[PDB]
Design an enzyme around this catalytic site. Structure first.
Site, mmCIF file in Angstrom:
data_model
loop_
_atom_site.group_PDB
_atom_site.id
_atom_site.type_symbol
_atom_site.label_atom_id
_atom_site.label_comp_id
_atom_site.label_asym_id
_atom_site.label_seq_id
_atom_site.Cartn_x
_atom_site.Cartn_y
_atom_site.Cartn_z
ATOM 1 N N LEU A 15 0.816 -1.199 0.000
ATOM 2 C CA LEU A 15 0.000 0.000 0.000
ATOM 3 C C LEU A 15 0.852 1.252 0.000
ATOM 4 O O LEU A 15 0.359 2.337 -0.290
ATOM 5 C CB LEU A 15 -0.906 0.020 1.213
ATOM 6 C CG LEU A 15 -1.955 -1.077 1.248
ATOM 7 C CD1 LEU A 15 -2.699 -0.993 2.581
ATOM 8 C CD2 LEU A 15 -2.917 -0.946 0.092
ATOM 9 N N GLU A 17 5.318 2.888 0.423
ATOM 10 C CA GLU A 17 6.722 2.670 0.770
ATOM 11 C C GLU A 17 7.392 3.993 1.003
ATOM 12 O O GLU A 17 7.058 5.005 0.359
ATOM 13 C CB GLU A 17 7.430 1.873 -0.355
ATOM 14 C CG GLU A 17 7.453 2.572 -1.718
ATOM 15 C CD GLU A 17 7.872 1.689 -2.895
ATOM 16 O OE1 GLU A 17 7.204 0.674 -3.201
ATOM 17 O OE2 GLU A 17 8.854 2.054 -3.557
ATOM 18 N N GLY A 18 8.337 4.002 1.938
ATOM 19 C CA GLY A 18 9.129 5.206 2.188
ATOM 20 C C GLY A 18 10.502 4.879 2.721
ATOM 21 O O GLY A 18 10.948 3.744 2.653
ATOM 22 N N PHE A 20 11.789 4.462 5.614
ATOM 23 C CA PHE A 20 11.942 3.684 6.844
ATOM 24 C C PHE A 20 11.147 2.383 6.901
ATOM 25 O O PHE A 20 11.226 1.643 7.887
ATOM 26 C CB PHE A 20 11.589 4.583 8.039
ATOM 27 C CG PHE A 20 12.464 5.775 8.148
ATOM 28 C CD1 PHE A 20 13.781 5.631 8.579
ATOM 29 C CD2 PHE A 20 11.987 7.052 7.829
ATOM 30 C CE1 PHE A 20 14.610 6.724 8.679
ATOM 31 C CE2 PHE A 20 12.808 8.154 7.955
ATOM 32 C CZ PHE A 20 14.130 7.986 8.353
ATOM 33 N N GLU A 22 7.569 0.034 4.971
ATOM 34 C CA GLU A 22 6.443 -0.045 4.037
ATOM 35 C C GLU A 22 5.075 -0.220 4.757
ATOM 36 O O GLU A 22 5.005 -0.481 5.971
ATOM 37 C CB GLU A 22 6.683 -1.211 3.079
ATOM 38 C CG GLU A 22 8.065 -1.259 2.442
ATOM 39 C CD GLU A 22 8.209 -2.300 1.346
ATOM 40 O OE1 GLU A 22 7.582 -3.384 1.410
ATOM 41 O OE2 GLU A 22 8.965 -2.019 0.404
ATOM 42 N N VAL A 23 3.993 -0.023 4.007
ATOM 43 C CA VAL A 23 2.649 -0.402 4.440
ATOM 44 C C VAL A 23 2.190 -1.563 3.524
ATOM 45 O O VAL A 23 2.260 -1.434 2.306
ATOM 46 C CB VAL A 23 1.642 0.772 4.333
ATOM 47 C CG1 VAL A 23 0.303 0.404 4.948
ATOM 48 C CG2 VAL A 23 2.177 2.030 4.997
ATOM 49 N N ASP A 154 -1.093 17.392 10.146
ATOM 50 C CA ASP A 154 -1.034 17.137 8.677
ATOM 51 C C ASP A 154 -2.405 16.709 8.128
ATOM 52 O O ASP A 154 -2.514 15.724 7.380
ATOM 53 C CB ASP A 154 0.080 16.132 8.312
ATOM 54 C CG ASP A 154 0.475 16.161 6.791
ATOM 55 O OD1 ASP A 154 -0.013 17.028 6.018
ATOM 56 O OD2 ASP A 154 1.219 15.249 6.332
ATOM 57 N N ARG A 158 -5.474 13.601 1.551
ATOM 58 C CA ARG A 158 -4.492 12.507 1.395
ATOM 59 C C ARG A 158 -4.272 11.656 2.668
ATOM 60 O O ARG A 158 -3.852 10.518 2.593
ATOM 61 C CB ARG A 158 -3.143 13.056 0.867
ATOM 62 C CG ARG A 158 -2.360 13.866 1.869
ATOM 63 C CD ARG A 158 -1.091 14.511 1.301
ATOM 64 N NE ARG A 158 -0.668 15.517 2.252
ATOM 65 C CZ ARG A 158 -1.027 16.791 2.228
ATOM 66 N NH1 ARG A 158 -1.784 17.282 1.245
ATOM 67 N NH2 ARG A 158 -0.637 17.600 3.205
ATOM 68 N N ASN A 159 -4.555 12.210 3.845
ATOM 69 C CA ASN A 159 -4.416 11.446 5.092
ATOM 70 C C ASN A 159 -5.758 10.992 5.668
ATOM 71 O O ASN A 159 -5.829 10.560 6.845
ATOM 72 C CB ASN A 159 -3.672 12.285 6.130
ATOM 73 C CG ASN A 159 -2.174 12.191 5.979
ATOM 74 O OD1 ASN A 159 -1.622 11.110 5.708
ATOM 75 N ND2 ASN A 159 -1.496 13.289 6.211
ATOM 76 N N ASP A 172 -2.675 9.120 9.528
ATOM 77 C CA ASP A 172 -1.500 9.925 9.316
ATOM 78 C C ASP A 172 -0.384 8.997 8.884
ATOM 79 O O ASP A 172 0.032 8.120 9.653
ATOM 80 C CB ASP A 172 -1.110 10.668 10.602
ATOM 81 C CG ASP A 172 0.108 11.607 10.414
ATOM 82 O OD1 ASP A 172 0.592 11.768 9.272
ATOM 83 O OD2 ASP A 172 0.591 12.191 11.408
HETATM 84 C C1 LIG Z 1 -0.940 0.398 8.905
HETATM 85 C C2 LIG Z 1 -1.107 1.764 9.476
HETATM 86 C C3 LIG Z 1 -0.415 2.213 10.599
HETATM 87 C C4 LIG Z 1 -0.605 3.527 11.097
HETATM 88 C C5 LIG Z 1 -1.469 4.430 10.464
HETATM 89 C C6 LIG Z 1 -1.811 5.813 10.998
HETATM 90 O O1 LIG Z 1 -2.724 6.437 10.455
HETATM 91 N N1 LIG Z 1 -1.192 6.260 12.222
HETATM 92 C C7 LIG Z 1 -1.468 7.449 13.004
HETATM 93 C C8 LIG Z 1 -0.597 7.972 13.918
HETATM 94 C C9 LIG Z 1 -0.947 9.075 14.711
HETATM 95 C C10 LIG Z 1 -2.217 9.652 14.589
HETATM 96 C C11 LIG Z 1 -2.501 10.852 15.509
HETATM 97 N N2 LIG Z 1 -1.327 11.715 15.655
HETATM 98 C C12 LIG Z 1 -0.882 12.351 14.431
HETATM 99 C C13 LIG Z 1 0.404 13.120 14.606
HETATM 100 N N3 LIG Z 1 0.223 14.057 15.695
HETATM 101 C C14 LIG Z 1 1.399 14.925 15.868
HETATM 102 C C15 LIG Z 1 -0.170 13.402 16.918
HETATM 103 C C16 LIG Z 1 -1.479 12.651 16.752
HETATM 104 C C17 LIG Z 1 -3.130 9.113 13.702
HETATM 105 C C18 LIG Z 1 -4.506 9.736 13.510
HETATM 106 F F1 LIG Z 1 -5.296 9.009 12.705
HETATM 107 F F2 LIG Z 1 -5.093 9.921 14.709
HETATM 108 F F3 LIG Z 1 -4.313 10.904 12.914
HETATM 109 C C19 LIG Z 1 -2.754 8.015 12.909
HETATM 110 C C20 LIG Z 1 -2.162 3.986 9.339
HETATM 111 C C21 LIG Z 1 -1.921 2.651 8.847
HETATM 112 C C22 LIG Z 1 -2.736 2.318 7.670
HETATM 113 C C23 LIG Z 1 -3.424 2.091 6.778
HETATM 114 C C24 LIG Z 1 -4.361 1.807 5.713
HETATM 115 C C25 LIG Z 1 -5.561 1.180 6.044
HETATM 116 N N4 LIG Z 1 -6.268 1.075 4.934
HETATM 117 C C26 LIG Z 1 -5.564 1.640 3.918
HETATM 118 C C27 LIG Z 1 -5.848 1.774 2.536
HETATM 119 C C28 LIG Z 1 -4.922 2.407 1.743
HETATM 120 C C29 LIG Z 1 -3.758 2.879 2.290
HETATM 121 N N5 LIG Z 1 -3.461 2.734 3.615
HETATM 122 N N6 LIG Z 1 -4.365 2.119 4.407
#
Ligand SMILES: Cc1ccc(C(=O)Nc2ccc(CN3CCN(C)CC3)c(C(F)(F)F)c2)cc1C#Cc1cnc2cccnn12
Ligand SMILES: Cc1ccc(C(=O)Nc2ccc(CN3CCN(C)CC3)c(C(F)(F)F)c2)cc1C#Cc1cnc2cccnn12
Length: 301
Positions: A15, A17-18, A20, A22-23, A154, A158-159, A172
């Site tokens: 899904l 890559e960067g 550090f 991948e997803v 952010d 896109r997020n 995110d």
């Molecule tokens: C595997 C995975 C791991 C982690 C995360 C992730 O979103 N982490 C995250 C970290 C922090 C925060 C809150 N902070 C932000 C920064 N901030 C400074 C502090 C607060 C949030 C938030 F949602 F709350 F924002 C999320 C997403 C995926 C995904 C996926 C996925 C699932 N379906 C699909 C379909 C297509 C593509 N990708 N995908």
């Protein structure tokens, strides 16, 4: 507090890559075997359990590992219908993994790019009320983040991720998914920033707050009402976007605002303008943004 069994994660596709890691999209092998207090997961008989997995490259620096573990801690706390949900982790050995629900319709930018507004554009339609519902869900998730004293930093289409029946989950991706490089400007060394979504105080003073999240919500809502067809401030260069932040600071009326999208009524537009107030304390809270989108805008169709 035990690791999810890595051997049960069956790879399907990448899904993202960067630098550090991948997803991955994975299927969980025979998920019913796992259901317990330790993993009280939702399995639907006759339906595969798909999950997303963020994975840290095994040769990652110690600071990259601490970043990953910090993200795990944050994610472990997030429990809301409009925020991506952590299902399990693998951290007692390498490679480090975090496992979330999978949103089958991808990111919201991809989703809306593929749709046209209900009556040459192509593809499936989406109605104006459905767009208000998308936006309301984003405001609801952000409200929840804010009550937990998190700042997103952010927010943009896109997020955001789309599941079944127009369900939105805020996410995110950080550096795990290097799409949308055109949305970030290199301000210094290796640091790139989403300047077209950032409040003037973010750009000038590196100050990120719930109020700068409200400013980014304004821009995100503008994206939604434009059906992701146009870059915010697309008429301006990156250097001109930075200059525009300086004019919000100067406050002598030279600053420019995003224009009203054609599907946007004047009241919703004036609410977006309030999201871009110079003073933080004049920007609307997410409770008020959510109410407007779920009630006021709906009642005046
Ligand atoms: C595997 C995975 C791991 C982690 C995360 C992730 O979103 N982490 C995250 C970290 C922090 C925060 C809150 N902070 C932000 C920064 N901030 C400074 C502090 C607060 C949030 C938030 F949602 F709350 F924002 C999320 C997403 C995926 C995904 C996926 C996925 C699932 N379906 C699909 C379909 C297509 C593509 N990708 N995908
Ligand atoms: C014109 C201009 C261009 C570029 C940049 C710039 O690079 N800003 C920057 C913002 C944030 C961050 C990231 N942060 C994360 C969290 N953290 C707690 C703070 C650090 C970084 C980064 F480089 F660190 F990434 C840079 C600043 C200016 C300015 C200005 C300014 C300040 N006072 C005044 C008064 C009058 C006019 N201008 N002005």
């Amino acid at each position: 507090r035990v690791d999810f069994p890595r051997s049960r994660l069956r790879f399907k596709e990448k899904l993202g890559e960067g630098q550090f890691g991948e997803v991955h999209l994975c299927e969980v092998d025979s998920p019913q075997d796992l259901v317990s207090l330790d993993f009280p997961l939702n399995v639907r008989k006759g339906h595969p359990l798909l999950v997303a997995v963020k994975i840290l490259r095994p040769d990652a620096t110690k600071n990259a590992r601490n970043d990953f573990l910090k993200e795990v801690k944050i994610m472990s706390r997030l429990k809301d219908p409009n925020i991506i949900r952590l299902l399990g982790v693998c951290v007692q050995d390498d490679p480090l993994c975090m496992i979330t629900d999978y949103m089958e319709n991808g990111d919201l930018n991809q989703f809306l790019s593929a749709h046209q507004l209900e009556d040459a554009a192509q593809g499936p339609t989406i109605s104006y009320p459905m767009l208000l519902h998308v936006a309301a869900q984003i405001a609801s998730g952000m409200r929840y983040l804010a009550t937990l004293n998190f700042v997103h930093r952010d927010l943009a289409t896109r997020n955001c991720l789309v599941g079944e029946n127009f369900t939105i989950k805020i996410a995110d991706f950080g550096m795990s998914r290097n799409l949308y490089a055109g949305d970030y400007y290199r301000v210094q060394g290796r640091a790139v920033l989403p300047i077209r979504w950032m409040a003037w105080e973010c750009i000038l003073m590196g100050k990120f707050t719930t109020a700068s999240d409200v400013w980014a919500f304004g821009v995100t809502l503008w994206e939604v009402l434009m059906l992701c067809r146009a870059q915010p401030f697309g008429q301006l260069t990156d250097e001109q976007v930075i200059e525009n932040a300086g004019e919000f600071f100067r406050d002598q009326g030279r600053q420019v605002y995003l224009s009203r999208p054609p599907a946007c009524p004047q009241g919703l537009y004036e609410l977006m303008l309030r999201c871009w107030s110079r003073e933080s304390e004049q920007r609307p809270p997410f409770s008020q943004l959510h109410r407007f989108l779920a009630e006021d805008a709906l009642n005046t169709v």
